[PDB]
Every structure is written in C-alpha cells, then in structure tokens.
C-alpha cells in the first residue's frame, strides 16, 4: 500500500496474513503438500525515486514470517528474507539491479506459477536461476531499447555462493531470457548455466561441473482467460532426495512440463485447472523416476483486492512405489488471505 509519496520518492509498504491449512492423511510423511497449519504472513517495502525525467532508483525488500511455529525453539522455522535488491532504470536503456532476486529462468517459469497455493514446483529457491537466489546482477530491457514494442530481454550474472549446504550453494554462472508479447499472447525463452561448487560435486546424487536450467513459456492472457504452458529441462540442477537410502544431491537431468488454465469471472470467482510433471532421468541407482506428477483443481474467490479465499486441490499421480520416496497422497489446502 502506498504510504509515502512526496518530493519524487514513493514507498509502498505491503504485506498479508494468510490463514492456511493443508488436509492430507497419515503421519504426514506420504502426501504432496503435508498436513496441518501452514499459516504465514509477509512484509516488505517497494520504493522508487524519480532521480530525474529519465532516471529512476528503486529498492525492494520482502520477508516471510511463518505463522505456524510456536514461540519456543522452532520460532524461526521457515522465516527468511525473500527479496533484497536495489537498482537504477534509465529511459529505454535498461535497468540494472543487484541483490537477492528472482533468477532469469523464472522469467519463463512465472507463466505457470499462478495457482491458488500450489504449482510452480520447479521454481526452487536458492537453486541457480529458477527461483529466488542471492548475489545476482540482473540487466533487463523493455521493448528493445524502445524500438520494438513488446520485445524484452534480460541477462543475469550469478556470483558464487559457497554455503554450508550443497542444496543452497552455487558457483559463478550466466543466464538470460528473451520474450515477446502481442495482444494477450506471450512467448518466453530462458536459459542459465553455472559452475557447481566442490560440495555439490561431493554429493552422491549428480555428476557434472556445470548446472544447466532452461524453460520455454507460452501464454494467452486477456478476455478474463489465462492459459499457460512451460517446457523445460535441467542438468545437475534440480535438488533431489532418496528417502530410502537417505542420500542427497541433484538429478542428472530433468524434463519438466506445466500447464495451467484459469478463468476470472467478474463476480470474483477464478476456477483453476492445472497439470504438472517433472521427471528425473539417469538418477544413480534408480534411472528414470518421477519427482512431480499431478492434476490440480481449485478456485480463488476475490472479495476485492485486499481479501480473498481459496481451495487448492492436488490430485497426486506419483505412485506409492516411487523409487525416491516422493509422496503419493493428495493434498487439499484451504486459505483466507488479507493483503495490502
């Protein structure tokens, strides 16, 4: 919500409180999304200052506060800064920002990351270029320097992150994206490649000096309709876990597809239908095994732009015998959202 706008600077302080509950069965160890309270809140700011006619400075920070932890030792579980970056935008020359931001491959993957609560299964956090990462320098360009309406492109430099965990680490890498939009239709292409760290190479699942991620996106978004599809493959980039052996690392290769269809009624209801499949190929010890496989049905009800409610239902197709231990049961999430 815009709380300050004077002398060229504007600050938007935003957030939400989401009451959220997942319904599955068992001890919780075999479903898609889990079971019980999943409440969470968020707080951030988005600032922008008009340096002059052509030049804008901007900054953004966003934090995730789980609401399903006790005030005891588990108090900070799942809490983190989602975004933290600052940059400059100059006329039609471009923008440049640095800090913790969305990887370039998310430029494609965002087409299908539109479900009520689930979806966007391959846009992992701290995973090279597909989700939020730390230490990325991103150059972005709109309308090809103002010459070609609807034609955008970006390049992104991923600096190495030698963390304690293989899962959360990354070496130096370059990525990019190109897209074109015209009358509701849009097409994107995005690719990234980075070195893996020693620690990543030491894990038992995954062989290669470089991680690679790419995705394609197609969509139709107008007339209250939203149809989207993404196609992508990864090499040594998708984090995987063998639940049986309890080993860990990255899948040698993944083939991933996401499909989404939604309709926005003027009365506020927005039914959603989706299909998601992610398959790991050549997993040492396993070979081909599905990571993600489901059908999705759900709806959001928008009271207005501050209040909404939803039900998100995952018809899980992963089988009970799945070679990696990936859950096979269904999950139904139900949530009430206030946002500003």
């Amino acid at each position: 919500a815009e709380i300050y706008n004077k002398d060229g600077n504007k600050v938007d302080l935003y957030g939400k409180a989401v009451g959220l509950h997942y319904f599955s069965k068992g001890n919780g160890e075999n479903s898609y999304g889990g079971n019980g309270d999943m409440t969470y809140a968020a707080l951030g700011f988005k600032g922008e200052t008009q340096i002059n006619s052509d030049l804008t400075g901007y900054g953004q920070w966003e934090y995730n506060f789980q609401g399903n932890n006790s005030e005891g030792a588990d108090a900070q579980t799942g809490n983190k800064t989602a975004l933290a970056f600052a940059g400059l935008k100059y006329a039609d020359v471009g923008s440049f920002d640095y800090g913790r931001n969305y990887g370039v491959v998310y430029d494609a993957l965002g087409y299908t990351n539109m479900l009520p609560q689930f979806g966007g299964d391959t846009a992992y956090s701290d995973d090279f270029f597909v989700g939020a990462v730390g230490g990325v320098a991103t150059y972005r360009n709109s309308n090809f320097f103002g010459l070609v309406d609807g034609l955008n492109f970006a390049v992104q430099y991923l600096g190495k992150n030698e963390r304690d965990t293989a899962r959360r680490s990354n070496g130096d890498g370059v990525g990019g994206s190109i897209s074109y939009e015209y009358e509701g239709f849009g097409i994107v292409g995005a690719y990234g490649a980075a070195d893996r760290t020693n620690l990543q190479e030491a894990q038992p699942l995954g062989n290669g000096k470089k991680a690679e991620q790419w995705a394609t996106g197609l969509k139709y978004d107008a007339n209250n309709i939203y149809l989207a599809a993404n196609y992508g493959e990864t090499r040594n980039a998708t984090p995987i876990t063998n639940k049986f052996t309890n080993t860990s690392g990255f899948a040698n290769k993944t083939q991933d597809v996401l499909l989404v269809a939604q309709y926005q009624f003027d009365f506020g209801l927005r039914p959603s239908i989706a299909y998601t499949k992610s398959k790991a190929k050549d997993v040492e010890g396993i070979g081909d095994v599905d990571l993600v496989n489901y059908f999705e049905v759900g709806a959001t009800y928008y009271f207005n732009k501050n209040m909404s409610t939803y039900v998100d239902y995952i018809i899980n197709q992963i089988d009970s015998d799945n070679k990696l231990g990936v859950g096979s049961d269904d999950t139904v999430a139900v949530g009430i959202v206030y946002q500003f």
Copy 2:
C-alpha cells in the same frame, strides 16, 4: 497508527519500544521475574477492508523483537510472531478467523491480564486455549446475532500441533466462551478440552489423554475504576518443571485465582494492586505445591497514548523450600514505553 485508509481498505501499522529492567538479587536463579535488561520492541499491522455494507475482511500480524540480545549467536532469543491470522465478519452473523491467535480461554483470563508488566501468569503461550497458539479456527458472535445487546459467545477449533517439544505441542481440541456485559459489569465463562500428543503423554509429569482448561471472569470497569477477578482450573494443561530432578511435563491439576484493582486518575497515574495464586495438585512425587503466589503493587504513568512509564513490584509469597524449585524472591520491573 493508521497509515493508510483509501478505497475501502485501512491499515494500522503499530508498535513500540520498551526500555525495561528487572531488579532482583543473586545469580538470578531464585526470583519471580529475573534480573537485568528486559528491553523489547514490537511491530505489527492490523488491516481491514470494507468488502460491502455488511462484509468486512481483516488480517493481523504482530512480531516480538527482544532488545536484550547481542548481535551474536543469541540474536533471535525470545523473538517470534505473536499473532498471524485473517478472517471475515458479516453483519450480525459473526466473524471467523484462522491462524495464530488467542485461545478462547483467554476471553476469560484477559480480565486480570492488565498489570503494568507482570500478571496474567496462567495465560501461557502455545498452551492449548489460554494464550497465543497456532492453528486455531475461531468463530465469534456479538450481541447474540444482534438480538441481545451485550451478550457474546465464541467457539474455537484447535488443530493438532505435533511439534518437537511436549511443552509447545497440542492435539485436536474444541473450546468456547460465553460472556455478558451490562453497565461496566461483565461476566465470562470459558472452557476448552483437547487431546494430548504422544510426546506429551511420554513426559514424567502428567497423566491423561486430554488436556482441560477453564476460567470464570467477573469485572467492574467504569468511572475510572477497574476491578477484576478470575477463577480457573486446569487438568494436564499447565506446563511445570521440577528444578531439582530436572524432569518436565504438565501438572495433573491446577486451581488458579487472580484478583486486580486499579484506578485511573485524570492526571495520568494508574495505581495497581493485585493478588495471584496458582496451585498444582497431585504432582507425581510432590502432591500439592504452589506454582505462583504473590501480591502486586505498581503504577503506570501515562504522559499520553504514545508515552508512558511504570514500576511493577512483585511481593513474592512462594516459599524458599517450594517443592518444584519455583523462585521465592521479589522482582521490581521499571520501564519506559513509546508506542504508536
């Protein structure tokens, strides 16, 4: 403080910085409240949107930031999200919210949780229905569907929380409260019952498949006067610790009383007097032992609604030989509060 109010939505961004210091004696191990710096700050938002004439959506989030930790490894000690919930309110039909909120038994216990800094000793956090918990669905009704002025009621569903700690866990449970207010007087009744988790049952202090908490409240609140009393009992619900053996769990039963008397002078001073006693009955190995036993004297000085100061003095009656190790010394807290 209301920082945004446009197009039906309103956001109140609030908080405070409390400079706070507790004065007791020793190595700190035998007083009521402890010793040294107890500074802390808080930040939250309270949002509300007018969906239409009869329908309101709302959301609230509040965080506690201790101010007595170093910037070292103890940085997050005592930090947590106090509240995180969202809901809807419809005409005189009721309200419904879900997330981390106050348990229904706090509807009674809030009558006496009005001291300058201490008090409200049996409104434990993450303890079924007496304080803040995660995963509660609360229905609330004002004035009996608009038919009986001053007659309110609530029902609350506690979903299971199988955490790592017995202290912070809970099984499924139902609770409720009924109250009546007329001309400064008010009477409340609140009860809750939930299953205990396996981990709770495994502890050495406490036997039972269900936790039970109830409290009654009576008050007079008008003419600058505030008198309140609460009477309550718990079964397998009050967290207790044997300091000598170093065992832990919940008291088989508790009998608890709280009494409060305060006066609000027009010049800003508000003297406070209180009595609090909590007794555990049938503690395995001990039998009857007091958990809480003291007299309270204090005053708050209100410069206005943003600035205030106080002194809170606990005359501790727990004896030096207390069977559980509960401190016997006095505590004096002194604080200066800025809030917005």
Copy 3:
C-alpha cells in the same frame, strides 16, 4: 520517511535495500573485508510525541536483515535488532533513554565512522561503550542546560550482561562524553570503564578486572568539507582472536588512530580518503601486533537523498606474517543503495 504526524505524535518509518559485493582473492580467509555478496536491508521506526511544550517522549527500533543468506538453515545469519530504546526529553534539562543504543564512546568514534562502507573499525558491537550495546541508561545534555551554546555532555550506565559468550558479555560500568562545537569545528572526549565478567576473565587472551575505553575526536565540517581525526586507547576491551592457536579474548591494551578526509561536490560526488591503525600491545604470547592497518580511497555518488552508489577501496597494510592471523589482502566493495 514520515508516514504519520497527527495529534502530537509523529512516526518515521525508514529503511533501505543495499546491493553490495566485496571483491578480494583466495578462499576468502586472508582479506580485509571478505569476498562475495554482502547485500543487506534494514527496517526501523523513529517515533516522537509532543507530551507538552517542554516534554517529548521518543522511541526507536531498527533491525538488520542480511540479504546474502539462503532460505535454508543459514537464514538468520547476521540478523539482529540494531537499536531498541525509549526515553523522555525535557526542555533544556536533558534527555534520558534506556535500551539497546550506542555506547558513549561512540560519541567520539562517530567523527570518523563516515566511510562509504568500511571504516569505524574500533566501534565494535556489544563491546562496552564503543558501539551498540544492550542495557544502557543514557543521560544527555545539550548546550549546558541551555546556558552554553554548542557545549554538550553525556553520562551512561552500562548494566551487566552475563551472556553465553565472553565476546558479547559485559559487567556494570559507567561512561561519559563531553563535546564542543563552534563554526564547523568540533572536539569530543569520551571515556568508559566497566567490570569484566567471570567468563571474560577465564579467556586466555587478557588480564584485568576492568575494561577501559577512551577516544578523543576533532573535526571540521562545513563548506562541503569534512575532515576528522580520532585518537583512542583501550585496556582489556578490544576483542581479538589468535587464528593460529585458535584462542580468544581481549587485547591487554590497544592504541587506535583514525583519519578521514572527504569532499562533497554539489553534483553529488563525494570522494573519500582515510587512514586507520589499531595496535594491540602486550598480547600474551605475541607482544605488539597490528589489528588494523590500512589506507582507504573511495567515493559515493548521491543521485538524491534516496538513491546512491559507491565504491570503497581498502589498501591493506597488515603484513602477511601478522602474528594474530589478521588478513593482509585488499578489499573493494561496490554497492547500490535505495533508502527511505
């Protein structure tokens, strides 16, 4: 940014998002500042209420959110409440605040803590009186009770902090500062002394029952010019580490000098030049060894008061053989800052 100002109370909600990257060489273990992403954000509030003509209440809270952590187990690394205090100010009688605030010796040390990113090397956090600490009661006076324009003074009471770490602990102590300003020139003197805790005494580096810190400050600050110098010594107060033996504690004595020269061009550029040297004397096992020794060059470019950019270059003079293991390589930081 001032987001609320009504009925005597005013709230300033402030913050920034800083994209920041340090460039050094190696595995990172031998430079001045380190290597890689150093992004971080900040959020705080500064409130003030006009109680009456002569009396003001105030409160402040500030948090540091690192932006170079993953959303994994290292999520809270470096996160903390920087400041949390409240107080009262009465006419020309003085101000008094309590909570986590800057130690009095920082009244002197702030003269040279003005570099783009580095500098202020002896204003350690949680280190008696030179940086931010918890549990300090500070009385401050401006213009000698309104009698002597430009003549200020302060006294500060440090309450004991018996933490888990020797580094972050402190005993009871008193400190003070006096300063005088006239036409761009300013001179400060500040001293503090506190008891050390048992844990501090138990460490292998440092002998003494009391910690002592003092600094002198001189500056010229007008005509777009800023020249400053600080001279100070510590006794058993500067935290030190022997990287070779892996021991820890405080230097018996330190001698510290800081020099800064900057120029603020009207077009927005502010070149900076600085010199910093800190020497430890009589370190058990070592004798005299430099802790800090470098030359600094840098510039900040101010687009306006919300956006800025900088380069900060440390020409490190510590030698490769430094007896304590203190890094000898150079560091270049580069950052883009949005603030409000």
